[PDB]
């Protein structure tokens with residue numbers, strides 16, 4: 099539980115200048131502090147450079163990276179940091195690597211929590227929740243204790259939704275609206291599938307939203323989606339497909355992707371992550387929206403409270419967001435969303451011992467983790 | 473030796489629109505055709521998305537990717553292309569994957585030839601040159617036969633320098649000035665090292681040039697380099713270091729990098745590659761320069777002709793370049809450059825059977841391949 103223990107910089111990033119705003123590069127904004135857990139993993143190995151290049155926050159936004167890793171993968175983190183220095187990225191004003199959350203999360207304005215333990219060979223969902231839940235329970239206290247009171251936290255380590263509930267549950271000082279579960283890779287994969295069916299390039303499909311858990315209970319919402327400007331429903335008139343098939347296509351994208359030999363969707367996920375961050379740092383296009391697993395309290399859809407449930411949101415580009423109100427539902431959608439909700443509330447109970455609710459009671463389906471995920 | 477055999481597109485990229493310049497996105501330039509060999513490898517897995525994101529050619533430059541792979545790694549290429557489609561990159565107007573150079577290199581304006589066979593466990597340099605030389609001999613004929621008469625070719629597969637000589641030697645219709653050997657990762661690594669020693673951030677070091685082969689005979693030129701605006705020589709006054717140590721630090725960067733467990737400098741190399749391309753597509757900053765293994769004919773330094781020797785160049789950002797004339801040399805520099813030249817001319821002879829010169833005569837040192845390279 100550190101205090102006074104500040105994070106040490108990394109070679110060259112220690113030799114950095116004053117602060118962009120007054121001598122050279124006065125065009126640059128004030129530096130943004132970004133923390134990344136799972137910093138030595140594959141998604142990170144992609145994400146990091148996209149951040150450093152200004153692809154994420156812009157070309158006039160000097161960045162500071164605080165890479166949180168783990169004992170075992172420390173050599174790896176040193177390596178990534180070594181690649182970071184040989185990249186000569188001007189925006190990357192400073193980087194620091196370490197294994198202590200209370201040190202690394204120190205002053206973080208964005209906490210991109212990718213990284214959690216992989217599903218064991220014969221591991222039951224409940225324990226998958228327990229193990230990673232603990233990691234996130236801890237990172238939550240750290241964030242709470244030593245991070246910017248308005249840290250925008252973005253969770254990608256599975257089970258992301260619950261992992262996020264836990265994180266905010268252990269980080270009371272931090273606004274729960276700030277915690278996001280990454281369902282965006284799912285959104286992108288779904289646009290691609292709706293473009294593929296309709297015979298249009300993915301840049302013509304929009305208003306795609308994902309509801310529920312980042313698991314096989316999520317719902318690639320085709321009812322409110324649009325292609326070219328008109329509801330998907332009246333472009334892909336094959337209604338049976340949309341209901342009986344669409345979902346399973348997005349739901350297995352990663353699974354087929356992995357068949358093209360063993361690599362995870364690192365590059366794509368790395369991309370989803372930046373698109374995710376941008377949807378909060380950039381004003382949502384007129385009439386469109388993005389998907390994010392966020393806290394349910396305040397939602398107008400009727401979804402249960404006290405959980406992290408992905409839903410349509412729009413932003414003015416300030417880090418915050420608001421739920422999208424102009425949306426419709428039917429028997430299909432309504433029942434599918436409610437079915438994911440059931441799952442989530444069960445994980446919640448199964449994770450009562452890491453959320454501060456009480457004794458855990460697990461009754462979960464060991465078949466829901468998305469194909470292709472580590 | 474295809475003709476009439478055109479490259480088929482890939483799912484979603486087949487459903488693409490007209491051509492940016494007249495309906496929507498009239499701000500966009502005319503599409504650029506980019507071919508990538510070794511498309512399913514690690515450096516590519518990084519490079520590709522940087523290209524697609526517009527990081528390389530700009531945000532108003534729609535791109536077309538022609539990914540050349542190999543039979544064995546075809547499943548992998550399908551996978552990368554699958555990640556490409558789930559990324560929803562607007563600039564990535566079209567992509568096509570395949571294993572035939574005469575098909576894939578069809579109409580290429582940029583041929584980023586990363587990818588060649590790795591050094592065998594007990595493989596002698598000569599054969600390393602032979603094996604990869606053949607690949608490049610073939611890709612050269614293809615490029616020559618079916619590519620844009622002004623293809624800018626950028627070789628990264630080792631032995632890059634010779635591999636490039638061979639490529640242009642088998643591609644007579646294509647201007648030899650167009651072939652580039654990637655010595656940029658080396659340049660970047662060296663700036664980082666000169667920044668580290670002088671106690672300044674890498675953004676204060678400039679005019680670093682690399683001469684010779686992309687091997688342990690190259691010369692991280694500290695004599696013409698500058699820090700803050702004044703020659704490195706009068707900032708890092710520890711002259712013995714610059715001569716006796718500097719070189720070995722850059723020369724082993726990859727070697728130490730790999731010690732931080734088994735991953736190649738994929739992310740960094742991916743970065744060097746884009747910096748390389750930009751130095752040709754962007755006007756070189758006033759007084760600075762970049763390093764590139766290019767054809768020697770016309771050089772004013774005294775370096776031997778008919779080889780690919782990295783040297784200082786500047787560009788107006790049109791794809792072409794010119795050698796930098798305002799540069800000095802001393803006993804140290806002069807002798808070191810000449811020693812790399814010796815190597816190169818020996819590889820040249822060792823590769824006479826792939827260059828159209830005659831019977832090969834190999835007499836090479838089996839210790840020169842840079843630490844950390846596959």
Ligand SMILES: NC(=O)c1ccc[n+]([C@@H]2O[C@H](COP(=O)([O-])OP(=O)(O)OC[C@H]3O[C@@H](n4cnc5c(N)ncnc54)[C@H](OP(=O)(O)O)[C@@H]3O)[C@@H](O)[C@H]2O)c1
Nearest residue numbers: 136137138139140141167168171213214254255256471472
């Ligand atoms: N939401 C999505 O769509 C999505 C997509 C892909 C993956 N995921 C999920 O995210 C998790 C892993 O992501 P991945 O596939 O990218 O794996 P990965 O790149 O291989 O990274 C896994 C990480 O676990 C890390 N680790 C263990 N304990 C940690 C802790 N105390 N703090 C920080 N890092 C810790 C390791 O740390 P080091 O960094 O030190 O190695 C390692 O990097 C999985 O549960 C996976 O299912 C979600």
Ligand SMILES: NC(=O)c1ccc[n+]([C@@H]2O[C@H](COP(=O)([O-])OP(=O)(O)OC[C@H]3O[C@@H](n4cnc5c(N)ncnc54)[C@H](OP(=O)(O)O)[C@@H]3O)[C@@H](O)[C@H]2O)c1
Nearest residue numbers: 510511512513514515541542545587588628629630845846
């Ligand atoms: N200049 C530099 O500083 C630098 C830096 C790093 C590496 N390199 C050199 O580049 C070469 C490999 O790069 P790497 O480390 O990035 O390896 P990598 O990512 O693992 O890729 C190696 C590739 O060899 C490919 N291949 C074999 N025959 C091919 C052909 N007919 N056409 C197209 N691709 C072919 C494979 O094809 P698939 O794409 O189908 O798998 C594979 O991707 C090595 O010789 C290495 O030393 C140079």
